[PDB]
Design a protein around this ligand. Structure first.
Ligand code: HEM
Length: 446
């Protein structure tokens, strides 16, 4: 059975707070650090059970995860069963056709030992917790870098910086979640190390944890907006409506959350808002060839790249259950200032904003790394299409800084190709292990 009292809350349900801070640290003195890990951190680590009850939301929700070098620092030399985690994300950068030369320097190495995720409805409360941690740990912990993040304001709450409603679609864990129409249903061990049908043997103390892939992804919002206007397909509606259609073709959903597969020519804001309906699709349509039909949703659309559904086989009617092992739980949150008037007017980014991307999975090679390398960056994925060259994911696909060729986006002609500049720019990140809560004051403090 899944022991959710022992699982850190961000993994399965998110922090449920307006503000987050990602505090990236080194461990200078493992003896003193361990003492305070047990006494000061472990008691305030928020569990899935705690965060799932409206009566037990803490003022500051706190989670903590460790990199490979952070575990080594703590004298933990165990094999957690994940080569990508052990090697660190910087060594993995080439797999995604990017260079660490573009990264925040602190990420371009393995000096980061962990991340504390602090979440609260105000930054003042976060800052107070940080001050407390720095006081009680002294120099045994040291801040290397940090990133502040926030839910976006007003009617954009829950939307990412490009304006799209986010975190709609997640895997349902069999026995834990009540599945929604269309939602994939997966074994707990796809997300939680050592849980049901995780095929990789783990250290005993690590059962109930998950690997956290962190990415600092800058978004070029004015540039994206202008691109859509400049490349809007011809049609009867306003120019902006036609630009909106192109954006929806790139993401696979309208900004409202309505999936284009179910409403291919216009938004349906009521559909987007309804969790019982907004995921109820497989990409299959009777009387259309799945291998060639891009009239409902392009093969290159972001969500189709990241959850192929019927493109990888399985049921043509909902729920499609394909590629469960390639599922990730997402807890990303936007960062940076809102787009200013001047930036919008000049169509030019002058301040850094984007997504503090957080993905959880039990195997990095099957989750984040797979989705980036085998799908988003792969012009021939999904397989079996006609024509075969799908092109890259227009949102996250990478090709060493060059414009991405993306096919199928234009409804009038599925063979029409666009060469699209990057609108998402990686500043790097790291792979961490979020341990079960018992390990925090247990093995890791021993
Ligand atoms: C700044 C970068 C990104 C932006 C703006 C973005 C935006 C979005 C949006 C708007 C959706 C639709 C909402 C939803 O279906 O929940 C979505 C879905 C999703 N994204 Fe991204 N995303 C980004 C990065 C990534 C990365 C790096 C990955 C993985 C390598 C990823 C994986 C997914 C997955 C798995 C889904 C759900 C697919 C499904 O289950 O149908 N995203 N994203």
């Amino acid at each position: 059975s899944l022991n959710t009292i022992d699982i850190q809350g961000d993994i399965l349900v998110g922090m449920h707070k307006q503000k987050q801070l990602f505090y990236f640290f080194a461990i200078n003195d493992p003896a003193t650090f361990k003492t305070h890990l047990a006494s000061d951190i472990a008691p305030v680590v928020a569990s899935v059970t705690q965060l799932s009850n409206v009566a037990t939301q803490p003022l500051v929700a706190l989670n903590i995860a460790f990199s490979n070098t952070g575990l080594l620092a703590l004298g933990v030399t165990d094999n957690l069963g994940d080569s990508l985690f052990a090697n660190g994300q910087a060594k993995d950068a080439t797999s995604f056709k990017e260079s660490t030369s573009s990264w925040v320097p602190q990420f371009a190495g393995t000096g980061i030992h962990g991340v504390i995720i602090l979440a609260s409805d105000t930054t003042d409360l976060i800052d107070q917790q940080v001050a407390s941690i720095e006081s009680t740990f002294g120099s045994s912990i040291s801040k290397l870098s940090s990133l502040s993040a926030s839910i976006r304001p007003g009617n954009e709450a829950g939307h990412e910086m490009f304006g799209f409603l986010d975190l709609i679609a997640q895997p349902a864990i069999n026995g834990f979640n009540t599945p929604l129409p269309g939602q994939n249903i997966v074994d707990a061990g796809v997300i939680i190390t050592g849980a049901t049908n995780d095929p990789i043997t783990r250290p005993s103390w690590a059962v109930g944890g998950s690997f956290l892939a962190f990415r600092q992804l800058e978004q070029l919002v004015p540039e994206f907006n202008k691109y859509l206007l400049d490349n809007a397909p011809a049609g009867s509606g306003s120019l902006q409506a036609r630009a909106d259609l192109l954006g929806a073709r790139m993401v696979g959903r309208w900004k409202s959350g309505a999936p284009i597969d179910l409403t291919p020519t216009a938004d349906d804001p009521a559909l987007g808002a309804d969790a019982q309906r907004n995921n109820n699709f497989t990409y299959s349509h009777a009387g259309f060839d799945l291998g060639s039909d891009q009239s409902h949703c392009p093969f290159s659309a972001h969500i189709r790249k990241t959850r192929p559904r019927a493109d990888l086989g399985g049921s043509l009617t909902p729920p499609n259950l394909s590629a469960g092992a390639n599922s990730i739980m997402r807890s990303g949150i936007p960062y940076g200032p809102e787009v200013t008037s001047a930036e919008s007017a000049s169509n030019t980014t002058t301040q850094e904003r984007g997504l503090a991307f957080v993905a959880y999975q039990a195997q990095l090679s099957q989750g984040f790394h797979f989705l980036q390398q085998t799908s988003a960056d792969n012009a021939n994925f999904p397989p079996g299409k006609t024509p075969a060259t799908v092109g890259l994911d227009p949102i996250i696909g990478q090709n060493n800084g060059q414009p991405r060729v993306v096919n199928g986006l234009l409804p009038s002609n599925s063979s029409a190709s666009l060469s699209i500049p990057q609108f998402v720019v990686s500043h790097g990140g790291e792979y961490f292990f979020s341990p079960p809560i018992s390990a925090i004051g247990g093995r890791l403090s021993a």
